[model samples]
Target chain A: AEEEELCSYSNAIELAFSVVLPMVMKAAVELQVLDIIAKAGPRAQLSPSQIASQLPAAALRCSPDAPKMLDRMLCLLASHSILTCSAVDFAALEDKRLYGLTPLAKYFVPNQDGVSLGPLMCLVQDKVCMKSWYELKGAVLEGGVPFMRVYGVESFDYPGTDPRFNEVLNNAMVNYSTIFLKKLMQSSYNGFEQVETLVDVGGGLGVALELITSKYPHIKAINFDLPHVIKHAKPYPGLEHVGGDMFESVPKGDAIFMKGVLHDWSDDLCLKLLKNCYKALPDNGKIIAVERILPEMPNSAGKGIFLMDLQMMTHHLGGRERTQQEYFDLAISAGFSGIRLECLVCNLWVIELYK
Target chain B: AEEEELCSYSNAIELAFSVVLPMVMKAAVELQVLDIIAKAGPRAQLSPSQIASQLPAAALRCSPDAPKMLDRMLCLLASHSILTCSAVDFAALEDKRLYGLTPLAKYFVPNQDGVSLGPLMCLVQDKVCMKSWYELKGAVLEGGVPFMRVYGVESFDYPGTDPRFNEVLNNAMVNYSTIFLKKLMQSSYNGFEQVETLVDVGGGLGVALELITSKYPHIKAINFDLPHVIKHAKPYPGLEHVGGDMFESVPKGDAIFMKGVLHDWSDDLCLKLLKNCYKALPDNGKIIAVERILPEMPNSAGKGIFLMDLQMMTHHLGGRERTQQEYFDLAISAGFSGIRLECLVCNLWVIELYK
Candidate 1:
């Protein structure tokens, strides 16, 4: 009984200090440590000194303790199984520990397509982004959004004013969309078969449209966003970038697809957006909305959804992830005759609303 | 093959956004959500509205969305199994989720002795402490402690200036020692049995010596620390609080007990302190030192140790947790004729150095 009690107490301490790992991982990502290891090839391990030698010349020259410090960070990652560590010489005078990438580390390293979760990780853990979390208690007790309270502006508006944050946000969205959209396409979703034209609302860089149009060459794709965002988008074959206010208008298409968009607004605002989508669609057309549907019961299975929901609440007033029933209600209220919900990988859902 | 690849990618996203939970948990601790639920009774569960009603009247009156926001925070905790949640009315119009405490939650709540890990959680996650994490990358590449780089003072020195942080650190140590000391006494430790006088070097409030003297009533206990710390320590039965610097000299005793003292300094400083203890002990006497010994291999079993070791590096230059071999070398170098190590719960080791 005593043993079990102590074990639980120890576990609680681990969770209480859990913030350590993510911050360390963020530093590792910022240093491009994972990328450095990946360049060494699969199954190859490198010691801290070896990795330190490859760092920027200025950084290595200025940081005398860089090797020892890097070793400590990598050791923590290895302990969490994010990286694998092995002893080079057990009895040697010099303590030599070599590190290699674990399967999970691959996602932090950019792949052939320049897609990785590193940008997303850095963005979330960024000081500016984390400042909002400090205001969570005040926001909860004073009826205000944490992000707006901290920055004196809403999260979406702040990005436009801050160029560095803007780039970070954009890169994170592109990388996140690249991976999520690919898995989404591979899912048993076929709502695009009959559609000759697909409009992607709030598509900043046309990433989703690019992937979809490449898959179904017969379909013409229109990437719609704010004028500034649209101007920065790179062109892709069979895809056209159009700029306009999503609230007032969306491009005409057989199917209007929106991924990760509606969760940033209230039911009233979501209703307005859905009604606009209904107006833009033709007869028998549908709106394929990709989002996270909160599970009815709060369990480990819905951990990701619960986390994202709180994030929305913190960043935007009335913005939150909704349950399937809530989505159904919103679709029906917007005049959709029928709604079909399909489960995709990574806690994503495809909610198709028929016009 | 695609499924496995997508699964790894999804898991990676989970880790990248892992910072969310810890921050949420910090907010919950600040709000005393765990304590509120705990006061309801062991098995009694309460809904968010019920918990919100128990909050300060000012908080409830000003925050219209307090219940909803609290619900979201509690829901996330439940998903992580820190708290247990169940639907009170499955088909009711009002979605009611009742929450109760889990075993882990017990450690977060203060018991009869006023012992809890909540203060420690708040201290580490405090903005003042978190500011240093932002400097981690720079610290790694600039040959400086992250905390010192950000705060312009070593972590230990900063505490003397910041009263709030000082209180938080003291409370954390007291609570941590209260639990850990109790477990240490219960373990297969009998070093105090043969000793008539025991000196606790660097013992802030004499928590370790109090527990030890209480167990073995015949032993005389001395709590030694810096002048300011000793001045604030309350009186305890069969314990004497003495003010002095450990590097200069420790109180003479048959056996000297130190818990969590050595990890905050480099080998040279540790050797100086150990040698001081050696001079303070009589012939055939020993020193009972409690600390975390880093494992030879970095794995899940040593996750806590590695995290803490890195924390030392980030907060204090040359401060680090050492391995058993390192401890052995330090002890032998300090003129101790023999050394014995014993495993205690919570990754603690009791290393006895015989003169």
Candidate 2:
């Protein structure tokens, strides 16, 4: 009983203090504090006053307490290792703390290649996503998704109508996928070895296939998605960008490559999409689904997938994180004979279902 | 540099996932799941379906997906140890997982004794506070409190106008203080030894003063604050509820007690309040200020105080978490000869400033 009490109190404290870290992280992204430090170059550092001086005009408004407040904010960023802080001496100006970007903070700093998760951070912190997350329990108890409940439209549809929101989300998906896809190509997965041609259903901008086709010169890649989404696709050699709805049909290919796609649709929808992949493929062709395979036992490794599962429920219908058994059941339901899984360099998996 | 890079990538992952836990926690509070499980009695557990059935009518509105979502939410709660889950056999109806209240969850479960921190949880999750938190960096760099920037009024004044917000903040202070004050009285502190009477300036609802007076029966206590705030003060023996502003004047007492108060004012305002406190006491009388003392070293121990200090900047102008030396400067500048520190339960300290 005493032990239980101790455990609970600690949990409460964790809940209290940890909840605010995200808000701080969000503020850091909005302020572009990390980017400012990163731009100062390697081994470069700045004091709070210096960082504040480089901030946007909106954050540079006159206030006597601004520097003091910024110092406190910098202290928090450094405490989290988003920024590194030097030792301070209360009485000496020379001993004042200096702030510099950490590798984690650098990840959000935008480069010419547009490979930063900064936009993704902005998306997560946006009011629409956050409010839905706050109402997540309702989505779980109610039949509809929280996104639909809030915006009166499905997740994809809302973005289709709002250009700014669409841009934020699209950038988020691209930035998030680019890192994972790079890892996927570097991994030991041989699923693509026998494939002559591959089509990526719902692949935005064909960024994933860009990485794959670049690595394997013999393989042809087709990037298929909605026509509107296809318009934004940047041209890449050896990879053709085609626009179409997957629910209607998919382009012919020896293998269908999907990264972080199947989890967005419900089981019924997933089956429908899978059937299309099957119909579009030649005999003995395989369907490659790249997504997280939730662990059977609850463990730390599975926590990320579980959190994403909750997020999917918040914004998308029929979306969820599935275990290996769940994936097998879905594959069988979709008329696939058998399936095998290969782990990627990162936490995701390559599950191939053979016809 | 490589090791530093590794540390940063890991820190980035921690920041990404740790940010979402609070959102889930906020959703739980909104659902009142903790209170429901606690009301079920000790060792009493319920599955998601059972628990959902007992939720508010609006939450349980007929929906096939509701129970499943609730189950996912329950899984997260149990995963965090906020609630404990019994063994489950997915194939059998009787083997459905059951969730029971843990000691931590119970701490937030409102009881007849009014000891729960549930109100504080609600206040922290409130939209008003959250929006301000999101704008925290702006407040820091732009030289203004987020509260006034959002609501166009001081933190204290806005509550006077908005009844709902007022109630939420007021109850949070009460709930937060009750636990701390109880721990405080049970712990050792000799500052009250020579003091025959102590005035709890800005004692909201007299909760802190109630605990102090209850413990030190021989020490007369006066709960002082704005006239409107004192109206809600519950009657406690050996305590007198007085109405006034600290900036203007304070009630007479052997010692002036201020808990989490001075941090809400600027150093100039704090000195003004301290002078008033001094005038209200005789020669050699002491003013005991209780607050979180920010540590000199930028380490884990100081993180909580650093967070609170940022929170203060977000909501209250001139309010901040201060170092021990800063506190000493404020007290001494207000005419105090010297200061002595007494560590109390939780992160608070009693800095007794002598006249």
Candidate 3:
């Protein structure tokens, strides 16, 4: 593998793209080639002739620009091994290579069980995020946040301005939510027997609780989040959507579940939010965090946490996965105790606490 | 190694730079942190604290805006081992990593020695070079140059336009020239002895020939190239410069040598240049060409010939490196006989033909 990549280019180009390669990879994800292939079905074999045409029809997706477009997509994706080339024809002095998804693309699939690192991916590769590196040294020095300097604004404001970006981000979060929920549920020692009600703070339309509540109907689910963010919230079946600010108050419940939230703020903000979570729950309440919980050392076993940290540096508010010590420090400040590792699915880890 | 790499991100700051690794690297290179470290006079080791302050001095060479200044360069170069870091503080729960230069920076060091890859380095990473990726599919589909599309009217004219870019490219070429000259001089075969006179076609500023003729004054030498190119080509102690194009005529000599000049043009142009060399030489004279001779199978070598094939695909007038067979074919077409080969320094081979 080292030799394979070493043969890529001279040290110059290698050093050059040491940055662009991942950005380009993220662009591929945003372009939705992985989703297109997955929707096409199992082992999802594709050819230039079948890309937007036969596959789109079969998958209930329409691509007016099919074959030639597919050709370009397949070529790029396959060249990078996100889509593995399964077959090849060398005639006409050029050939169309058949492609299938590699191990890399499996996580981004749209199934309820999938993980869409897609959102975090975008935030990391964003022009705003990329530009932060311009201030990395400045950031380390004087303990300043570089992303703010590069974007000329707080990192949290980017998604609010661009609807297309919002959608991509939301989808990515949904994917993360699904992945996190799976981990939490899978590692649950016991179901919702201990809790009668569940509140998801900053739940953004309650997609996560809907998934959880659908599985455990006995637990009444309440969704709380910012007004504008909840506006597009598509509440499913029985989850109640309550629009509000998290720092102000959280609805009363025996248990609170949160996902895709709280990474955007500094320690003080996180403490305030955690305090709200504590207040929202009753005595002996459960606080389940369906988020990436950093290991004692981010450099240890938390690659996802590490990458997400860089992403936070790029384009978001000071959101980052905290180490166990950092996590304990925040939760302790919020008056929560008995933190326990719950589960992990994909990269989404679960931490449940009791008070 | 992967496990070892994961250990580098001790804090969220480290992870952000690690995960969004590419953007960080790009910003760093653009910021010239590597160059900064190289300029810091070997004994000087800088902290991000020291780096942030020194960046404003780069006003003429780079942006003075601190945010646009050092952040990007450190972020990008740090990942590629261009700028290295060491954690100096373990107390106070803070990121106290100090920065220094790494082996990667050594490769791009601003000097004429120590593995100079400075010229070709810019060709692969400059902003103009980055734009080529977008037009690459177009080039591959059209089977022609795409740099023209990316840079618009400034393609061929770019060699000297942007001073920074010019310096980047020339540094790489200078590196290539130095390495090639050193290798040729130290190789198994000494340059021609019986030959009393030699002309080096397209010898950039006579640097290559200066290395050759300076060591052996017995061989009188003429450096041939364009007026614009050779304008700076002053007569260095033992070599004279001739300003002209290869198609029009070459300086007649007992032996004519050309290095790294033939592959940037079309087959017809190469033939024209070869025929000119033949015409300029005395009866039974030698025509010596030094270049990256492509292996019949690209996978067998890292000599950069096949890589140059892609370079020619995007630059110049539809030129490419030739395999031994391809070179022989082109030579046969150009009416050359008594072909011979001599392996020289790294990635360079010399082809000699007799009238």
**Candidate that would win on DockQ:** 1
Interface RMSD of 1: 1.7
Off by over 4 Å in 2: A1-11, A57-64, A88-95, A111-113, A137-143, A231-237, B1-11, B39-46, B59-62, B89-96, B190-194, B231-238
| C-alpha DockQ for predicted model 3 | 0.16
Candidate 1 per-residue lDDT over residues A193-274, each given as its tens digit: 8888889888877778887877888999999899877777886778888889999998898889888788888889999999
Comparison by TM-score, 1 against 3, better one: 1
> Of the candidates numbered 1 and 3, which has the greater lDDT value?
1
How do all the candidates rank in terms of TM-score, highest first?
A: 1, 2, 3
TM-score of chain A of 1: 0.93
Q: What is the descending DockQ order?
A: 1, 2, 3
TM-score, per-candidate, Cα-based: 0.94, 0.91, 0.74
Candidate 2 chain B: worst 10 consecutive residues by lDDT?
B87-96
- For model 1, residues B1-355, the per-residue Cα lDDT tens digits are 7666767766776787798998888888888788888887669798888777887656536566677888888888899888888886464322578888999888888887787888878878877878888888777776777887888876778887988887787777777778677667778877778998988888877767777777889999888999977777988878899998889998898888787778888879999998888788888678888888888778776666776676667767767878878988888899888778766766677787788
Candidates in order: C-alpha RMSD to true structure = 2.3, 3.1, 7.0
Candidate 3, residue A14: Cα displacement in angstroms equals: 3.5
Question: Where is model 1 chain A poorest over a 10-residue stretch in terms of lDDT?
Answer: A87-96
TM-score chain B for all models: 0.93, 0.85, 0.73
Lowest lDDT sum, 10 consecutive residues, model 1 chain B, at B87-96
Top model by TM-score, which number? 1
Query: lDDT for every model?
Result: 0.80, 0.73, 0.60
